[PDB]
Symmetry: C3
Subunit: 242 residues, 3 copies
Amino acid sequence: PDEEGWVWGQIKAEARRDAESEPALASYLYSTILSHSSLERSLSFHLGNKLCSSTLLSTLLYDLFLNAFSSDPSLRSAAVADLRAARERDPACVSYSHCLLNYKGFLACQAHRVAHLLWRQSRRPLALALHSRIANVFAVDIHPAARIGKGILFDHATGVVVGETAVIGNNVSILHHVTLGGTGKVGGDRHPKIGDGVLIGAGATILGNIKIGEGAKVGAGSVVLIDVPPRTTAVGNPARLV
Amino acid sequence: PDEEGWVWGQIKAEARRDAESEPALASYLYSTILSHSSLERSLSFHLGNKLCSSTLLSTLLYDLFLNAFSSDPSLRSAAVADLRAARERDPACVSYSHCLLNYKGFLACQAHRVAHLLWRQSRRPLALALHSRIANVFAVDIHPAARIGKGILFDHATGVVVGETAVIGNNVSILHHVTLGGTGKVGGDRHPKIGDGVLIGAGATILGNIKIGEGAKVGAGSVVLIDVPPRTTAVGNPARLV
Amino acid sequence: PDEEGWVWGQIKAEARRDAESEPALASYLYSTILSHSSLERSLSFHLGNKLCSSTLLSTLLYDLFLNAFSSDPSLRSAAVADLRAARERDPACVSYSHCLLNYKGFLACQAHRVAHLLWRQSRRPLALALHSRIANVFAVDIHPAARIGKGILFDHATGVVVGETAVIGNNVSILHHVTLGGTGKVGGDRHPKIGDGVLIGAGATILGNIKIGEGAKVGAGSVVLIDVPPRTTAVGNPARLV
């Protein structure tokens, strides 16, 4: 009945249709989704399997993710907001279950939120180990110390880089090959601050500690080295306001 | 004696020389190539091993690929054409066996052709699962619904993105970090149409449903937002005709 | 007491602190670092685990790397120089142990040096197999025939491409998504020559056999198609001297 409850209900219904139509995937859909009663448990199960390695057991990571989601209401809210963001804004128009299972941006983002929590809980070696796996597996390189809001859309997430001192607001869309990073300058605050509702086009590079205002749009291929005011469009190399 | 037969003959001879010279690779070359009597079986064997996961057994994928190649003459023709394309046009000048075994663009492309067939056979969940693995393993993100011709050259394929509604003709070369994608606009026909014999330079971004004419060339780093006429060169950000 | 000895001493001390603070990582830190008495053995152990596959046993790769480091004093010097380069120049300010364990650029680079040695020892099939794994695992595509110096910094190494005929001097910094590659022209010397102490900014593309002079800087997003004189800055698409 509630928002999360309804979304989870949709995920199960969709998974059940997919399991019935594709016997090669039926058991995996059962073990990941249909055998569970919550989004948190299914997401944790899936992330544990996706990110496991010889260093990190899938059952260990499953525990880690599940504990984090069960302990932290804001992580659950963020996951549902990000599922909604994909359902609403994804150009390829995703079902909830396909986003949950297959969307690398979405999955990397939820896993990053747990890495960020570890980082804040003074478990930085583990935060960094998790970060390394997320990069390995989802081609998403978001430093655990980066701050990101919710309702985030990560389209063709491969090669996304978000630096250590970056800040990303709510309802931001980050397309393919976006770099939110630095000049090569050593130390300190050196990564961009991205306002709510910003759209960053494919291949855009945004460098230095500059501001990208609320609702602004960055055109594809742009190299943005200056502050972009709210509700404006910046495009070009170097980027200029349009 | 036939074209495929001769190419396969070359692959075996080359593999045999490599197996004799490198004992660390001899068994793998035997199991993948020398123990088989066809290109289809060896390619299926190799793709099954490359793309397997805890979700998808290598023997299952081996069956899937082998069935597709045995059922679909055009898939076999495309694989041989793509092997020829690499042999003829690859700047690094590849042998047939090294292309078959090591070239990520070539392998991802053949696997994509099978994903495209599944998509057309109304096995879309499996098409998408296969697509996800191809992206995972070969750093090639071609949506199963994309249409691609044959004789395709994928140089430094890592980070290649080809969107859902893209169309690529025959004898096209797609270099490193090319994006054939969209603006962020939701739904519908939103990805480029690439004519026969087009060369797309490294890091080029081509967005929207625009036309890239036969024989055209796109310079490296270009952001192409307009139609490019046949036999012309477009370069720049934004791209202009030269 | 010696330089390598001191750096290795720091690595062990750091690993020991991390193992004490994070029980999830303690055994892995013990098996990789604390149970060994040299940087070479620990790096070989780690690279063997990172790069192993169904084709290549971790114990085989461990042997391969260890033999190379034990046989080749210049490989050991290069590894220490690259550790120093990260410690000194990395904007994210890395500890030695975190660089050794987690930095993909550093690890891919050391593994590449061994691939380059194999290539020179007429073990090219194995050099290429190793190269393929390095690309797979570290998202670093450096052809085994490429020549690179030491003191190299590879920031956000994902999607780095260095072509077959490229030459990179000492104390070079190569940031995210740099391409040192070619036009699409087939055969011959077709990749850039990078002087000592050059800084190449994020997303820069440098194509053709051109010269990038000592101490030069290439701005982010640049497409460099001409020779850059020493101690100068090139920026733009196409790049111009500033």
